[PDB]
Amino acid sequence: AGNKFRMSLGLPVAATINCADNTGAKNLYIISVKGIKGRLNRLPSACVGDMVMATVKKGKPDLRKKVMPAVVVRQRKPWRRKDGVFMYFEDNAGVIVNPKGEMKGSAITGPIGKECADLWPRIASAANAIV
Amino acid sequence: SHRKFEHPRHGSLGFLPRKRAARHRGKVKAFPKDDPSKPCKLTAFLGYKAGMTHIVRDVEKPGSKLHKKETCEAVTIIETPPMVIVGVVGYVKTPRGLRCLNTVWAQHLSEELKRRFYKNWCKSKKKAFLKYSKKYETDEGKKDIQTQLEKLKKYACVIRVLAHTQIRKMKGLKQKKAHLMEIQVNGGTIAQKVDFAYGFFEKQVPVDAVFQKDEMIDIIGVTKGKGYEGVVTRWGVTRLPRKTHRGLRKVACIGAWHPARVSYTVARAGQNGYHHRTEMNKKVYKLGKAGQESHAAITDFDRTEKDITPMGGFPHYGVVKDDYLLIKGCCVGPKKRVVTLRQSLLNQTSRVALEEIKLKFIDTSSKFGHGRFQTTQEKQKFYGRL
Amino acid sequence: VLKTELCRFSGGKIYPGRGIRFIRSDSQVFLFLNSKCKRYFHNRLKPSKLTWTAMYRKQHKK
RNA sequence: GUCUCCAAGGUGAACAGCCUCUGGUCGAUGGAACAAUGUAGGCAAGGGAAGUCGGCAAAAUGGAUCCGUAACUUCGGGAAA
RNA sequence: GGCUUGUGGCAGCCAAGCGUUCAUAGCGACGUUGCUUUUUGAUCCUUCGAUGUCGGCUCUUCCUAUCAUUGUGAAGCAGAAUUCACCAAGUGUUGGAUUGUUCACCCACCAAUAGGGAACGUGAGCUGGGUUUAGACCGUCGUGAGACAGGUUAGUUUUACCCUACUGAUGACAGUGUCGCAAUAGUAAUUCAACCUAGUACGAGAGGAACCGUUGAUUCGCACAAUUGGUCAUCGCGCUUGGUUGAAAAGCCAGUGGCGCGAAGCUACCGUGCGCUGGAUUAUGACUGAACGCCUCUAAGUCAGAAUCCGGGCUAGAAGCGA
Ligand SMILES: [K+]
Ligand SMILES: [K+]
Ligand SMILES: [K+]
Ligand SMILES: [K+]
Ligand SMILES: [K+]
Ligand SMILES: [K+]
Ligand SMILES: [K+]
Ligand SMILES: [K+]
Ligand SMILES: [K+]
Ligand SMILES: [K+]
Ligand SMILES: [K+]
Ligand SMILES: [K+]
Numbered sequence: 015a016g017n018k019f020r021m022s023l024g025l026p027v028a029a030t031i032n033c034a035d036n037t038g039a040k041n042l043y044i045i046s047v048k049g050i051k052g053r054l055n056r057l058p059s060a061c062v063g064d065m066v067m068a069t070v071k072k073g074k075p076d077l078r079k080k081v082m083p084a085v086v087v088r089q090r091k092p093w094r095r096k097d098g099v100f101m102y103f104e105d106n107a108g109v110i111v112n113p114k115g116e117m118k119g120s121a122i123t124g125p126i127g128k129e130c131a132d133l134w135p136r137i138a139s140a141a142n143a144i145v
Numbered sequence: 146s147h148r149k150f151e152h153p154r155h156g157s158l159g160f161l162p163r164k165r166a167a168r169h170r171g172k173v174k175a176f177p178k179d180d181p182s183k184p185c186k187l188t189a190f191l192g193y194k195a196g197m198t199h200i201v202r203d204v205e206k207p208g209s210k211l212h213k214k215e216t217c218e219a220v221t222i223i224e225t226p227p228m229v230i231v232g233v234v235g236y237v238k239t240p241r242g243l244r245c246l247n248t249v250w251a252q253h254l255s256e257e258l259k260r261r262f263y264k265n266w267c268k269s270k271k272k273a274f275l276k277y278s279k280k281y282e283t284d285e286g287k288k289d290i291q292t293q294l295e296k297l298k299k300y301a302c303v304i305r306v307l308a309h310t311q312i313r314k315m316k317g318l319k320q321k322k323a324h325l326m327e328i329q330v331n332g333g334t335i336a337q338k339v340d341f342a343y344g345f346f347e348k349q350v351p352v353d354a355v356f357q358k359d360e361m362i363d364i365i366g367v368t369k370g371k372g373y374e375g376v377v378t379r380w381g382v383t384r385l386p387r388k389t390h391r392g393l394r395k396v397a398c399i400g401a402w403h404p405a406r407v408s409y410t411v412a413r414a415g416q417n418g419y420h421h422r423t424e425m426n427k428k429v430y431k432l433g434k435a436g437q438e439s440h441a442a443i444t445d446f447d448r449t450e451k452d453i454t455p456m457g458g459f460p461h462y463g464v465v466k467d468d469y470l471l472i473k474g475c476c477v478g479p480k481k482r483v484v485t486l487r488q489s490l491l492n493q494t495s496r497v498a499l500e501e502i503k504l505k506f507i508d509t510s511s512k513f514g515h516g517r518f519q520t521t522q523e524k525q526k527f528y529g530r531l
Numbered sequence: 532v533l534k535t536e537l538c539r540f541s542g543g544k545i546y547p548g549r550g551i552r553f554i555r556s557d558s559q560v561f562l563f564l565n566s567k568c569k570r571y572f573h574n575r576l577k578p579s580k581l582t583w584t585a586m587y588r589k590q591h592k593k
Numbered sequence: 594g595u596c597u598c599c600a601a602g603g604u605g606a607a608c609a610g611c612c613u614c615u616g617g618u619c620g621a622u623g624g625a626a627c628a629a630u631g632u633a634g635g636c637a638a639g640g641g642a643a644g645u646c647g648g649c650a651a652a653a654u655g656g657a658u659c660c661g662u663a664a665c666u667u668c669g670g671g672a673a674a
Numbered sequence: 675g676g677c678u679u680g681u682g683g684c685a686g687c688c689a690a691g692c693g694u695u696c697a698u699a700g701c702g703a704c705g706u707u708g709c710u711u712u713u714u715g716a717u718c719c720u721u722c723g724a725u726g727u728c729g730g731c732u733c734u735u736c737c738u739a740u741c742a743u744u745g746u747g748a749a750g751c752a753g754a755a756u757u758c759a760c761c762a763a764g765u766g767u768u769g770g771a772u773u774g775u776u777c778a779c780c781c782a783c784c785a786a787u788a789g790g791g792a793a794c795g796u797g798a799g800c801u802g803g804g805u806u807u808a809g810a811c812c813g814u815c816g817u818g819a820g821a822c823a824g825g826u827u828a829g830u831u832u833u834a835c836c837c838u839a840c841u842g843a844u845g846a847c848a849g850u851g852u853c854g855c856a857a858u859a860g861u862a863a864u865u866c867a868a869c870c871u872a873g874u875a876c877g878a879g880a881g882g883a884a885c886c887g888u889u890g891a892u893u894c895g896c897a898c899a900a901u902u903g904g905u906c907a908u909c910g911c912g913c914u915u916g917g918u919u920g921a922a923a924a925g926c927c928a929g930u931g932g933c934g935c936g937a938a939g940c941u942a943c944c945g946u947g948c949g950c951u952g953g954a955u956u957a958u959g960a961c962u963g964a965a966c967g968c969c970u971c972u973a974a975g976u977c978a979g980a981a982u983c984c985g986g987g988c989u990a991g992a993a994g995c996g997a
């Protein structure tokens with residue numbers, strides 16, 4: 015197909031989101047967003063399907079006190095689909111991945127957005143329900 | 146010393162001064178280049194902003210994620226009744242630029258057009274063009290008119306027609322004073338241009354004679370007025386901290402010590418809105434012709450019998466009954482504002498410009514609220530009153 | 532034929548280019564006609580107790 | 594800024610706040626409009642201190658009834674934890 | 675601020691040497707010529723009947739000694755990457771932890787996170803954390819009052835209605851009105867990713883591009899409200915506390931009593947639409963062609979040539995003008 019269309023950003027830096035993967039982390043604390051060139055005073059922000067740098071605040075000791083990549087799979091901020099329907103999730107969630115985009119865990123606890131599944135084949139394969 | 150951090154400047158210096166436009170009707174600043182190998186054809190048109198709705202269509206764009214998928218897009222409806230041609234103007238090429246050489250008017254002028262020449266039409270004696278009209282009654286007068294047209298053919302380099310809107314056809318507008326504009330004639334020789342203009346005297350020119358579906362056009366008009374405005378909203382400067390003595394909606398430093406003057410590049414509070422603008426590349430999604438089955442909002446997919454006008458009428462505008470253009474996106478000005486339509490000055494070869502759009506659904510629900518019905522009959526059936 | 536969705540709160544008719552979609556934590560998809568229905572749903576108001584909803588009318592045989 | 598006497602009804606623990614009766618009073622130069630900037634008072638989707646020297650300001654909590662309450666302690670407290 | 679430039683910073687010249695050989699791809703010891711005033715000094719010319727004294731925040735503009743981006747020459751340039759140099763200041767140069775900090779040091783993103791001026795830009799623009807009054811504590815010094823290029827805590831930021839500048843607003847421009855021309859001034863677009871090219875060129879392997887084309891995105895600019903979101907004194911409807919009108923019904927008071935929903939208008943990268951192409955040329959590479967019978971991009975003549983300049987387009991429209 016083509017390329018992802020822009021969607022409303024609702025997770026600026028310092029946002030804490032649930033961890034939907036099986037790694038053992040409970041939440042993800044976003045410290046930066048990949049691909050952001052930015053502007054003065056503007057906080058980098060991520061959306062569903064974006065890759066971010068995050069740390070684990072609650073979880074196994076092995077996962078804490080370090081920086082790892084993560085991909086956002088759910089967001090509460092509504093965004094507009096090309097068909098005109100605005101949609102949103104119940105919570106904010108993400109999954110830990112390696113820089114190549116491979117999931118560190120093996121399963122996803124809840125649903126994931128279609129954009130993230132289209133962008134990341136491994137996450138889609140590990141997902142239960144898309145949208 | 147150098148500014149601590151770099152960010153782009155607020156606002157554009159290319160739309161200076163941010164003053165009230167010296168006009169209410171959009172002015173065509175540059176007409177499309179004339180190619181004499183094509184048939185004579187008009188280059189511009191006058192319309193009226195009726196309102197906005199949204200449409201759904203299947204997108205044909207290979208390589209795009211929307212390929213063979215539905216997309217919802219906002220559109221603007223512009224009512225474009227046929228224009229009446231009432232004169233011809235010819236200009237001469239000179240070292241100082243184009244100079245108007247002579248103007249020839251038609252014998253009969255409607256009251257709507259003549260209203261444009263008065264400030265108080267009702268109180269006046271209505272003498273405009275009365276002696277000019279008599280030139281068509283005497284043989285020497287017609288001979289003189291033909292001589293003027295011959296001179297226009299001989300000496301003119303660009304030919305423009307004088308056309309005015311039939312404004313009283315849109316009762317939603319409370320205006321009987323028609324809008325008059327000069328529309329350039331492109332194509333053919335100068336004599337051909339003059340003959341084309343003269344043959345249309347006291348005759349209507351439909352909008353489809355200038356534009357067509359899927360064509361990219363430009364819209365010229367005056368933006369919505371907002372009056373006196375501060376820098377934060379007028380220019381987009383950032384707010385100062387909460388604890389700023391004497392207000393925070395300001396530019397903190399309006400200049401350095403030297404030069405010892407405030408420069409034109411610093412944001413200042415002033416008039417906002419009511420500015421002349423020219424917007425490019427507005428695609429035409431449909432051309433509704435009155436009483437031709439194209440005026441209705443019925444599509445191939447949706448066969449519901451309904452008109453373009455939404456339930457309860459177009460807010461602040463009225464009911465669209467004449468020809469209209471459905472343009473993708475938004476256009477300048479508030480509702481009822483007269484907008485000038487301009488043929489593209491560029492060569493449209495891009496895939497987007499060449500795309501053949503097929504409308505699938507046109508929303509006609511009430512825009513004065515969260516409209517849930519497409520037709521009044523549907524609502525009446527829903528509530529058991531039909 | 533035009534394809535249409537239904538609001539899960541008011542049972543109303545939703546036409547193309549409109550509607551609000553809410554995805555619950557259990558992957559349940561809720562589609563609302565307008566902001567009124569969405570706000571009432573998130574306020575935990577039961578549609579069957581609101582007179583104007585389709586569910587109420589069906590339950591009361593209106 | 595300047596001492597003191599009298600002190601109704603309702604709500605409510607309450608000469609708290611809010612409304613009312615007796616008594617007093619509408620005295621603060623008036624009219625039109627509703628630009629910017631201000632002063633005073635609110636709200637704001639997603640994020641939640643990333644702002645800032647600093648959580649400044651604001652928000653959050655708040656009454657009553659029942660359950661329950663850690664370290665430490667001068668054994669009295671902490672505690673409305 | 676002014677003179678100067680020791681000191682700081684930035685360049686050049688010679689060529690002993692380094693660079694598997696080879697002074698000059700890339701460097702340049704011993705010496706030696708310069709430039710700059712974002713270092714610090716030297717001085718004391720201006721200001722002591724007062725020019726508000728650090729830093730940060732905001733905002734504009736300017737410079738090049740160019741970090742990235744456009745176009746090029748060179749290499750100890752196979753590719754990839756890198757390095758040296760040339761036109762080049764059009765565009766951009768970020769989010770954070772500690773510190774009052776300038777400075778510094780780390781985390782992160784990015785094409786890049788270059789260096790600087792504008793009275794060490796900017797306090798009747800803010801702030802006041804630091805320095806730098808009066809309170810107070812510590813250490814050292816002093817017999818003492820007290821001191822301290824040591825540390826600590828608390829400590830009032832005044833005035834614009836004048837002139838100019840700037841932003842917009844009337845008016846003037848020799849009847850009135852309509853439609854127009856037009857000097858001149860301003861100006862704007864920017865960068866990145868993905869697919870294909872292609873696991874191809876190149877390379878023993880390892881590794882590993884690019885043009886065209888397609889689809890998106892970043893920053894910025896101008897508008898707009900069909901949808902979503904925000905906003906309530908629609909005081910629009912409903913609910914509800916206390917009081918009050920004998921009760922019911924119906925209202926009122928608590929400066930918007932409070933709550934839920936809330937149309938309209940306004941409004942957000944929190945929503946949507948749009949954002950442009952002819953000429954002349956820089957560096958460079960070349961054509962024909964002497965000087966100089968050969969050679970030579972140059973001397974005469976000529977060509978291609980850029981995020982460059984000009985025009986066009988867009989904004990305004992002059993003691994300018996036409997029909
Ligand atoms: K960045
Ligand atoms: K500065
Ligand atoms: K701000
Ligand atoms: K903080
Ligand atoms: K600090
Ligand atoms: K020096
Ligand atoms: K001195
Ligand atoms: K002095
Ligand atoms: K700072
Ligand atoms: K104090
Ligand atoms: K005249
Ligand atoms: K120009």
Ligand SMILES: [K+]
Nearest residue numbers: 460512513899
């Ligand atoms: K609207």
Ligand SMILES: [K+]
Nearest residue numbers: 904905937938
């Ligand atoms: K609204």
Ligand SMILES: [K+]
Nearest residue numbers: 962963970971
């Ligand atoms: K030659």
Ligand SMILES: [Mg+2]
Nearest residue numbers: 054055056150
């Ligand atoms: Mg900042």
Ligand SMILES: [Mg+2]
Nearest residue numbers: 147148150151
């Ligand atoms: Mg800079």
Ligand SMILES: [Mg+2]
Nearest residue numbers: 511512513514
């Ligand atoms: Mg509406």
Ligand SMILES: [Mg+2]
Nearest residue numbers: 604605606607
């Ligand atoms: Mg009681």
Ligand SMILES: [Mg+2]
Nearest residue numbers: 695696698699
């Ligand atoms: Mg060598």
Ligand SMILES: [Mg+2]
Nearest residue numbers: 738739740762
């Ligand atoms: Mg240079």
Ligand SMILES: [Mg+2]
Nearest residue numbers: 763764765766
């Ligand atoms: Mg620059």
Ligand SMILES: [Mg+2]
Nearest residue numbers: 814815816817
């Ligand atoms: Mg002693």
Ligand SMILES: [Mg+2]
Nearest residue numbers: 858859860861
């Ligand atoms: Mg110019």
